[PDB]
Amino acid sequence: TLWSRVTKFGSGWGFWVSPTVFITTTHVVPTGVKEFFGEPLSSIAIHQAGEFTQFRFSKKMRPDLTGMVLEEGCPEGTVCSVLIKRDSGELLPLAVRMGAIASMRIQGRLVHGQSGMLLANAKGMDLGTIPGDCGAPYVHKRGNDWVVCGVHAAATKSNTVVCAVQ
Numbered sequence: 001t002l003w004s005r006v007t008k009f010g011s012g013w014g015f016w017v018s019p020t021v022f023i024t025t026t027h028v029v030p031t032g033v034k035e036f037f038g039e040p041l042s043s044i045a046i047h048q049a050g051e052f053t054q055f056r057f058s059k060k061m062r063p064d065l066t067g068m069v070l071e072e073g074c075p076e077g078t079v080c081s082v083l084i085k086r087d088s089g090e091l092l093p094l095a096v097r098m099g100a101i102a103s104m105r106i107q108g109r110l111v112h113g114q115s116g117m118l119l120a121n122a123k124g125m126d127l128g129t130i131p132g133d134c135g136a137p138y139v140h141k142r143g144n145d146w147v148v149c150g151v152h153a154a155a156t157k158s159n160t161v162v163c164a165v166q
C-alpha cells in the first residue's frame, strides 16, 4: 500500500500522504492546466516553494489510503529510501544517507532541501538520475510508522541526490 501512494504525475511522480494530500517536486507539475486529477483548481489548496509542491484537495481523492506523517526533512544522518517507480509500475527503492538542509540553485531553480549520498545496481538503471524519476518520495521508518520527508528533485550524473523539503 505504501507503493500504491507513488503516482505518475506530469514529467515525474508524486506521493499521496493521505486521501487528500499529494506532494511532488515543482518542476514536474503540469503547467497551464485547469485541474489536477480531475479536480477544479477551486477545490485544491496549492503551495509551492523551493521545488516542493503540496496539493491539499477538498475531496477525498485516495480513500484507499491512510494518512501518514509528513515532516519537513529529516535529521542529518538519517537513512531514507527514495521510492522510485518506473513506468511498468516496478518498485525500485534507492537507499540514501541524508545530509544538511540548504537552498541550492540547480539548473536555474532554487531547491530548498537536503542533499544526500546514495548507498552498482542503481547506476545500471540510472536510478534517480533520469528526469522521469523526480517527485519520488523520501521515506524513513519510525517503528512501523512510515514518515515521508521530501521529494526527489536532483541528482548528479554519477552519487549525490537532493530532495526538496517543505
Ligand SMILES: *[C@@H](O)[C@@H]1CCC(=O)NCCCCC[C@@H](c2cccc(Cl)c2)OC(=O)N[C@@H](CC(C)C)C(=O)N1
Residues within 6 Å of the ligand: 012, 027, 051, 106, 107, 108, 109, 111, 128, 129, 130, 131, 132, 133, 134, 135, 152, 153, 154, 155, 156, 157, 160, 161, 162
Ligand atoms: C528529475 O527531474 C531530475 C533527476 C536528476 C537527473 O535526472 N540527473 C541526471 C541529469 C543531471 C544534471 C545535473 C543535475 C545537478 C546539477 C547540480 C547539482 C546537482 Cl545535485 C544535480 O541537474 C539536476 O538534477 N536538475 C534537476 C532539475 C532541476 C530544475 C532541479 C533534475 O534533472 N532532476
Ligand SMILES: [Cl-]
Residues within 6 Å of the ligand: 001, 002, 066
Ligand atoms: Cl501505507
Ligand SMILES: [Cl-]
Residues within 6 Å of the ligand: 108, 109, 110
Ligand atoms: Cl526559483
